Structure formats: structure tokens, C-alpha cells
Amino acid sequence: HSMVDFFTIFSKGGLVLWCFQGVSDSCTGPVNALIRSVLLQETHEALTLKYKLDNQFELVFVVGFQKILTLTYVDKLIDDVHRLFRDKYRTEIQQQSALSLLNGTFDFQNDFLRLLREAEESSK
């Protein structure tokens, strides 16, 4: 159904900055995402968990999705999310001090749903 069922963005330092897990909740983990998105929705699907890095600003993007063959669309969603995130929050992320990430508010939900809703059209 949904292009991605799990998405989290954290610093390489280990700080979770923002995460998505349905317009239903606020990230409780890949396992619950597999239970809610696959098990309670019907071989059966699996959840592929992959990551993408931003080495310049030390970021990790982890995404969990169904249907390995949609990988190209998921990868584009990641790239679009990455580009926007790094522009919208460049100030908070280019700094060296962790306080910069700790004091930033990463209210990315809305920009993400937009990019998600928008990527689910390119697939069709």
C-alpha cells in the first residue's frame, strides 16, 4: 500500500532527529511497523530495511518498506527527502556542536508526507 512504512533520520552521533511510522503513530520500531503494515493487513510480505548516508553533515536515513521491486521509487523518495532535509535544516546540521541538533526543532512531518504523497504518483 504505502510506499514506505518506516523512516527515520538520525545523526551519526546517534541522535534521532525525526522519524515517521504512519500518519497513525510516532515511530515505535520496524517490528511494529511490520506487524501493522503487513501482518494485520491480510507467502506474505517482508520489510526491507536499508540506509543512506550523508557524510558531509553526518546523517543516516533508514527506511523500511515492502516489495523489493519498488526499490527505485523508494530510493528516489530518500534522495528527495535528503535534499530537502539538508536544505531546510542546513543551519542546524552543518555546525559541529551537538547542541545545534539538540536545540533544533525538526518538524519535518508535513514536508515528508508531501514528498511521500508526491512520490506515490510518480509510481503510477
Partner: protein, 188 residues
Amino acid sequence: RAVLFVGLCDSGKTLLFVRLLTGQYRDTQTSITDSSAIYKVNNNRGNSLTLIDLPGHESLRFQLLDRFKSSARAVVFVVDSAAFQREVKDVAEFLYQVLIDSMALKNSPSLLIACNKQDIAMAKSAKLIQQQLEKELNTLRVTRSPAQLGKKGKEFEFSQLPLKVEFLECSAKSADIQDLEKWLAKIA
């Protein structure tokens, strides 16, 4: 100067780091690089220390401790007090290298053993952790495959070390880090 937070994966280094800098909780994932930030101490003069959180993963722990050790005014070795019983050997083995590294330094950094995760019921006390770590380092200095620990002829104890070494208890989950901020203040 710098205060290095080191310890096995999941001991709570990053959460303590966050709690000290913001007083808040934040979700975290296994760290893959170091992170640093300025900490204004609780005392009158309000000195500033540079907290440096070091990844606990085996593939990165020493590479990064080596890189930052000469800049350390103090080292906080974090211990998961609730998982201590099963992890003792891994803890002692890493602490061993930390003790050695610290002594081989011109101006030995002050060292704290923060027995974290006290908020969990099954958590071993700092007193018991000190006792089991001494007993364990005592065997390691013999089995360990020249700087050495204490005196060969007497059972190992932290007091025999040419280093300031303290133990305290804490919890990153508000949290209970009063003693830790007190110690950090004291060594600033």
C-alpha cells in the same frame, strides 16, 4: 578541557551526554562517530568543559580513544548497571585498556566509573560493580595476552593506581545525574 565518555555499546553514553546538555530525554541509535559540545559547569565560576561522546562499538572504540586521549582532562567510563552481570568480562577488558592508556599519559586524566541505568530494578550497585571489576582486572593482568596494574604480588584494587578513580551511580532516564554533575563540576 575535554571529558571523554567511553563504555560498551548501550551503556548509555549518548543519553547521559544529552541529559547533561539539555536536561531532556531523546531517542538514540548506536553511535558511529563521536559527538561533542560545550558544558557550562554548575559551580560559581561556571567553567566550561568539552564533553565528547565516543562510540562504544569494538571497531571504533580504541581508534577514537587514541585520537582524543591526549586532550582529556577526565574520562567517564559508563557502565550499564542492569546488564553488568552478563557483561562483566567485556567491561573489565575495555576498562583495562582505558586504565593503561590513561596512565601512559603525561598528565593522567581523572577517571570516573559511572554505574548507569540505576532506575532499573535489577541494577547492581556501584559498590558491587567496583568489587567485581577489581576481582576481574586482577585476573586479566595475569591472563592478558611495560605498564602494569598495581603490584604483581598484591590482589588488584583501584586505589593502588597512580590515578584519581571514582565510582558513582546515575540514571539517564527527568533523570538522576546529580552526583555526575557534581563530579564534573569538581574536576572542571
